[PDB]
Amino acid sequence: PLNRRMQYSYYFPVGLFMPNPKYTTSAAIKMLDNPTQQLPVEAWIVNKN
Amino acid sequence: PLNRRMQYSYYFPVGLFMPNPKYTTSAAIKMLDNPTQQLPVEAWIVNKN
Amino acid sequence: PALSASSRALIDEFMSVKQTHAPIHYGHYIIEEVAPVRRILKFGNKVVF
Amino acid sequence: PALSASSRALIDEFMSVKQTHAPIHYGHYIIEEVAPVRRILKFGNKVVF
Predict the structure, then answer these.
(1) Any chain D CB within 8 A of the CB of C21?
(2) In angstroms, what separates the C-alpha of A31 from chain B's closest C-alpha?
(3) Which residues contact C44 (CB under 8 A, 6 or more apart)?
(4) Is residue D4 within 8 angstroms of chain A, CB to CB?
(5) What's the angle, vertex CA C30, arms to CA D24 and CA C23, rounded to 5?
């Protein structure tokens, strides 16, 4: 009984939208599309594997 | 009695304005705006938590 | 909050650099997983903690 | 003075780099804390002390 099970609740939002002054703080990534009309459709997560 | 409550004072400006020869000492910040025509309107403060 | 992103361009950024990476791209966004169980993430030979 | 900033971008770049963050951007500004107490700023997994 020392091997118990903790149960955390994980949450994450999808499809959000930034305010219209859009910034960036990585000067390495560059997408090949328009930055101003950019908004996500999905959310990539990671598994346990 | 020893567990006392020292209270300090904090202060910060909100919505200041840089002079007209503007500049930046950074590289990885790009804001989609005309840089010579932007000023703050809000101030962001980190909470206790 | 679980590890989420918007596109894989920020996930592959987060595995490369984990200190200087962006949390907010132009319209794209990525949320670092803060949790009690600090999961170890492998992606090929890049690994973060 | 407390950790004031005129955007979210200066916060999220001050969390990333510490010795080379931008004090004065084009129209925005961030203010380092010289408080007697020293708080760690748990942002995702990017602390600063």
Answers:
(1) yes
(2) 14
(3) none
(4) no
(5) 15
